[PDB]
Structure 1
Amino acid sequence: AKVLVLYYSMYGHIETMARAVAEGASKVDGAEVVVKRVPETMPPQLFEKAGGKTQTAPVATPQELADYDAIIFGTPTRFGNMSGQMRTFLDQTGGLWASGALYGKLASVFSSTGTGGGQEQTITSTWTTLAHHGMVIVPIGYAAQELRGGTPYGATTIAGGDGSRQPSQEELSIARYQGEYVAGLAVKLNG
């Protein structure tokens, strides 16, 4: 019943993706969905230098993850890993891990890429962390709406080597599906 869409975005691609995930999740009667971001780690100075898109979403604390029934994580792909910002935030969940707060909760991952390559590694290396927390891992498989560079691991979008490309209509429907699919799963379990 409570679903968190937790994301990191520097140039907006994941932020756009996270809105679509939230929309899908919101289609499920039962699901109370909220979107939050992980803190930006770079000082506003270095962020604006690199051309970053200022993020508006409320900043989540590591501790509040425990309140949710499902968490849908969004990260850009950073050389086949989650972002340093998402990795920093997850590194502050050691107290929750020790308590077993996240144990058995639903987890699912979405990503974005630029030139190309690494999106599958980003998603599956994120799963690893969720597994240490004892979270149930939800891939999208081949549903979805309905597939280019898609993966069964989770919704993705291509930004281009430029970062100019915006998520396509089909990438958004996949992202919506993902939110809706895990939300229904969370309601089935929570309900």
Structure 2
Amino acid sequence: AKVLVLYYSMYGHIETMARAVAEGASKVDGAEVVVKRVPETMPPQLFEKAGGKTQTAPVATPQELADYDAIIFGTPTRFGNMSGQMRTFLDQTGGLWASGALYGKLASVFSSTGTGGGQEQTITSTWTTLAHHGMVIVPIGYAAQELFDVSQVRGGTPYGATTIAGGDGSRQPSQEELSIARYQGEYVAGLAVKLNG
């Protein structure tokens, strides 16, 4: 099976999580894992001025989504929605939609916020789009044990992995957060192999 980890990141938090997801997915022997990013939509000079992080990942086209058996979407929260960059990208998949190109493919979502609020809503509002495409939606439930831990501040929900970046973005993803992100990649990649070989 081919698994795409398709993300948007301004400051690197989602990018770090995406690498944890790909690393989890890679544990699955029949799974070929690819990590790509959506295009930046901001002017490059404003991106740079805002202290945006440069990223090595190749840039995806909307069309190449059809080449995968499973897509794990990563996006920071913008007021409890996916980011304008991710939304802009998915608004270009009308050709794919009209030809049934993602129908029955697997979809899963991870997210990042500054102080936690909106992390659930970002994921489940992304599911809505995946559903219009007839994609099978993969939540993580409570198989990741770190989800039971209330002793430290941490991202992660039954809908998908998440990280808390802090108000100023100074937090890095915790071990527990990355561990849930690895689980998500393992689980979705296992389902992709199970369905598609």
For this structure pair, what is the TM-score category when the shorter chain's length is used for normalisation?
Answer: over 0.9
Asked if structure 2 preserves the Cα contact closer than 8 Å seen for 1:145 and 1:173, the reply is no
With 174-183 and 49-58 compared, the bigger mean Cα shift is at 49-58
Structure 1: which 4+ aligned runs deviate by more than 4 Å?
Answer: none
Q: Give the Å deviation of 1:51.
A: 1.1
TM-score, length-scaled by structure 1: 0.98
Q: Structure 1, residues 8-37: CA drift from partner, whole Å, max 9, x if none?
A: 000000000000000000000100000000
Q: Give the Å deviation of 1:40.
A: 0.4
Unaligned runs of 5+ in 2: 148-153
Aligned length: 191
TM-score, length-scaled by structure 2: 0.95
Aligned to 2:138: 138
Asked if structure 1 preserves the Cα contact closer than 8 Å seen for 2:13 and 2:165, the reply is yes
Asked if structure 1 preserves the Cα contact closer than 8 Å seen for 2:155 and 2:177, the reply is no
Q: Give the Å deviation of 1:162.
A: 1.1
Asked if structure 1 preserves the Cα contact closer than 8 Å seen for 2:25 and 2:187, the reply is yes
Asked if structure 1 preserves the Cα contact closer than 8 Å seen for 2:75 and 2:110, the reply is yes
Q: Give the Å deviation of 1:150.
A: 2.6
Aligned to 1:81: 81
Secondary structure (helix, strand or coil) at the match of 2:75 reads strand
Asked if structure 2 preserves the Cα contact closer than 8 Å seen for 1:36 and 1:60, the reply is yes
Q: Structure 1, residues 66-91: CA drift from partner, whole Å, max 9, x if none?
A: 00000000000110000000000000
Q: What is the rounded CA distance, in whole Å, between the counterparts of 2:131 and 2:6 in structure 1?
A: 17
Asked if structure 1 preserves the Cα contact closer than 8 Å seen for 2:115 and 2:166, the reply is yes
Asked if structure 1 preserves the Cα contact closer than 8 Å seen for 2:155 and 2:161, the reply is no
Q: What is the rounded CA distance, in whole Å, between the counterparts of 2:145 and 2:10 in structure 1?
A: 26
Unaligned runs of 5+ in 1: none
Q: Percent identical across equivalent pairs?
A: 100
